[PDB]
């Protein structure tokens, strides 16, 4: 399963391949993938 | 050292336009060919080639570079070998090369 965030109520959900794309709390049909937890390097130039 | 002439110097409002060189630069040595004409594909996004148009052909004719014109039209583009019958000029010769 992977972690998503509702685009309206900003609730974290845990969705699988079989689960429908929908917020179980408010019912919104748009989810934003949670930001990756691995560090990303940036140059200060 | 001081410049002999004096320079008009001051703030001015400048705008950055949408055209960037990194979004236009593209070169091709070889690449995919279109199914229909078997010539270099169009579009820099697909590693396509540049057009050697009629005006370019006329300029090369004026220069007299016949060999360069032939190389551009054959070696840098579609080049196909076909078998023709001496009785009929039709290219309907079945060639079992193997």
């Amino acid at each position: 399963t992977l972690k998503y965030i509702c685009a309206e109520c900003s609730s974290k959900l845990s969705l699988s391949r079989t689960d429908a794309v929908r917020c179980k709390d408010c019912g919104h049909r748009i989810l934003l993938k949670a930001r990756t937890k691995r560090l990303v390097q940036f140059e200060a130039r | 050292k001081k410049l002999m002439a004096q320079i008009f110097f001051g703030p001015t409002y400048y705008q950055r336009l949408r055209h960037m060189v990194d979004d236009k630069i593209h070169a091709r040595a070889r690449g995919p060919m279109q199914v229909l004409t078997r010539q270099p594909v169009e579009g820099r996004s697909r590693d396509g080639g540049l057009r050697f148009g009629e005006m370019e052909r006329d300029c090369m004719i004026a220069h007299g570079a016949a060999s360069f014109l032939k190389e551009r039209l054959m070696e840098a583009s579609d080049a196909f070998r076909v078998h023709i019958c001496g009785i009929c000029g039709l290219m309907t010769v079945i060639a079992k090369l193997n």
């Binding site: 179980k24 | 070889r30 995919p32 078997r38 697909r46 590693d47």
Partner: protein
Amino acid sequence: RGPNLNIVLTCPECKVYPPKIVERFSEGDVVCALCGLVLSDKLVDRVGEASNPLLDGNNLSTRIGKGETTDMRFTKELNKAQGKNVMDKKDNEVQAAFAKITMLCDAAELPKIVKDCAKEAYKLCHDEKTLKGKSMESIMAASILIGCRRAEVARTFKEIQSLIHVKTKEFGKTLNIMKNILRGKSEDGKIDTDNMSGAQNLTYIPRFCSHLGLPMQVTTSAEYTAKKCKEIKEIAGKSPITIAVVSIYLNILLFQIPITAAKVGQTLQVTEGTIKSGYKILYEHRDKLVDPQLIANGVVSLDNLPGV
């Protein structure tokens, strides 16, 4: 049962079979990954028309229409002549059936996938001995129902009947015949999944709740109630429509939404007596029909449910 006419790319120098091959699309080459030898060069990547060989098979045809300069006499005569074709007549029936299916689905405001699946089912089940004495209306309605179920947007028998004028006996017989045909072709030549089941009452609840204008929280509570309603033997035998309607009514009265059973049954085309009767059975197990999280949070408790 025919000539091979197959080309296999292998590196003569490496001789490894199967070979490691890399397709350099940018360079237009096919190169051996081990030695780097180029095996084939000058590889290829409106002038044509697209078609779907699943609903139309192999049938190439062109229309005749007006141009920048044209005389109506030639167009009329040419269309008349083109109409009188014997070979094309056979497929024109399928095309007309597709047109009517499209009209029905579009009037039903169904998604494109539903009508595409309906057309596919109609084409697969057409031209068979079993379906020869049944009305085209029944055939089309059964195909539409099958497509709706296959698209996870399953509708109900009454809902489809609201558009297609076919009686229940003919509709059910045709549906069974079509399902048998689909199963037979799935075996001999997939088709069905958990969705193919008949009851599937969970799918109906959101649409009924939308028709009644209830909030999504009430819709989810009704879905949970209907899901747990199958554990009671006194109700599991009821129609899925009745099960879903009774669950929705129970949740409506749980949340004290000012909608009476007289209007719930009128909107969902279900008898008010039936609704209240089902509520009577479910009231004896109200405790197992309410979400533990909801009752714990306290949005509402068991109290807000009048019992006769």
